[PDB]
Design a protein around this ligand. Structure first.
Ligand SMILES: O=C(O)CSc1nc(Cl)cc(Nc2cccc3c2CCCC3)n1
Ligand SMILES: O=C(O)CSc1nc(Cl)cc(Nc2cccc3c2CCCC3)n1
Length: 277
């Protein structure tokens, strides 16, 4: 007995609020990323980076919110690509922070708890949303203007040759669930409002918001996905997979930070990583 009642109408309102906020926070949506990847888009085709030549032709075109325009970019391709990826992570943090502030209840939480939830949550969300940009062959870069191949990334010298591999492995399975932006908006909100992050001051108000988000997600998935009766349970499983991906990421960043003692790690990512370990 699923029903239309005031409770369901409020859960649908929350779902729409989250969708509308997601569209305002994240310029490259899954809908847009799929249209690019499938060809279906009428926008110009992205530039493809599939080898060292196309990498150099392509970079003659890549751009960031904060341009870092001196000999601040390493000469070595692998380190430069990795530093570009760090800049993209920091841009994603900024977008995800803006999204989180639109989640009803979030800005009323203690500001330390807001920062804690973002600190321990953002990488789970980054890899969730990175799957939107990925297919079997590669990943959209430069906000959908470019595409870099999976095998090109695998070709970078140790220890830079597999930092995206676990995320491609997560994405091909996650993408098979065929979530849309309306589903993802709620899924991401649920992950951010996790009461079991370390050092939270007020756990109950976070759990109370999450329980409401979880009810919203379960209703959205039942309405939006008539083809599965398992999709809610499967997404709960994906949330625990994402924590493993983030642990494995931190470990790899330790190996890199101890092999490549010369290359600079972005200091805001360092603040996050130091406690994620
Ligand atoms: O963040 C670091 O510590 C660098 S390692 C890293 N690994 C991955 Cl799997 C992704 C990613 N950056 C990113 C974040 C969001 C979007 C995109 C990208 C990297 C390029 C594709 C688009 N950065
Ligand atoms: O754009 C993404 O989503 C990936 S970031 C990335 N990917 C590639 Cl394949 C190359 C590259 N290059 C680079 C890194 C850091 C700074 C700069 C440059 C190239 C352009 C000049 C500034 N940066």
């Amino acid at each position: 007995s699923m029903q239309l009642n005031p409770e369901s109408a409020d859960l649908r309102a929350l779902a729409k609020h989250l969708y509308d906020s997601y569209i305002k926070s994240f310029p490259l949506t899954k809908a847009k990323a799929r249209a690019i990847l499938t060809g279906k888009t009428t926008d110009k085709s992205p530039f493809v980076i599939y080898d060292m030549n196309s990498l150099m032709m392509g970079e003659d075109k890549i751009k960031f919110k904060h341009i870092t325009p001196l000999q601040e970019q390493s000469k070595e391709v692998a380190i430069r690509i990795f530093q570009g990826c760090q800049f993209r992570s920091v841009e994603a943090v900024q977008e995800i922070t803006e999204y989180a502030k639109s989640i009803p209840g979030f800005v009323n939480l203690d500001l330390n708890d807001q920062v804690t939830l973002l600190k321990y949550g953002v990488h789970e969300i980054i890899y969730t949303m990175l799957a939107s940009l990925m297919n079997k062959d590669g990943v959209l870069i430069s906000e959908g203007q470019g595409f870099m191949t999976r095998e090109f990334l695998k070709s970078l010298r140790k220890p830079f040759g597999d930092f995206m591999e676990p995320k491609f492995e997560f994405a091909v399975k996650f993408n098979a669930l065929e979530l849309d932006d309306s589903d993802l908006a709620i899924f991401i909100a649920v992950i951010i409002l996790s009461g079991d992050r370390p050092g939270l001051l007020n756990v109950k108000p976070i759990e109370d918001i999450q329980d409401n988000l979880l009810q919203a997600l379960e209703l959205q998935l039942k309405l939006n996905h008539p083809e599965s009766s398992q999709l809610f349970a499967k997404l709960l499983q994906k949330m625990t997979d994402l924590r493993q991906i983030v642990t494995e990421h931190v470990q790899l960043l330790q190996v890199i930070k101890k092999t490549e003692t010369d290359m600079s790690l972005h200091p805001l990512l360092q603040e996050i990583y130091k406690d994620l370990y």
